[PDB]
């Protein structure tokens, strides 16, 4: 007979590390690629030349 | 070169034993040998020559 690792139970504790717990966030492409128009209401009309 | 191995923790299982291994050496030799030449000349030719 002998004392295994299972025989000592929770006299052996398991540790924790947050060294893999990070994620860099990525913003939208279109809000950096193009002009951000500040709107004050739901609809803005923009006339364009058409013919 | 010796070889290590991964060992299990069990007291009964064959994978639980640490394996034996060895380091070895060999020999190389320096062995000295002669290389030589003899050049003969007339002594009158040594005396008559303008160079040493």
The nearest alpha carbon in chain B to A2 belongs to B11
Q: Are B8 and B15 in contact (CB under 8 A)?
A: yes
Is A18 an interface residue toward B (CB < 8 Å)?
no
* Residue B31 CA neighbour count, 13 Å, CB half: 3
Q: What angle do CA B39, B40, B46 make, to 5 degrees?
A: 110
Enter the resolution in angstroms: 2.4
CA gap A12, A3 in Å, rounded: 13
């Amino acid at each position: 007979a002998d004392i295994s690792r299972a025989e000592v139970a929770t006299l052996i504790e398991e540790g924790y590390s947050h060294s893999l717990l990070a994620a860099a966030k990525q913003g939208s492409t279109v809000l950096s690629a193009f002009q951000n128009v500040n709107m004050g209401t739901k609809t803005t009309h923009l006339p364009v030349l058409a013919t | 070169l010796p070889e290590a191995d991964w060992v299990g923790e069990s007291a009964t299982d064959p994978e639980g034993v640490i394996k034996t291994s060895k380091v070895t050496w060999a020999n190389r030799t320096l062995v000295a040998e002669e290389v030589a030449v003899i050049i003969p000349v007339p002594e009158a030719v040594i005396d008559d020559a303008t160079v040493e």
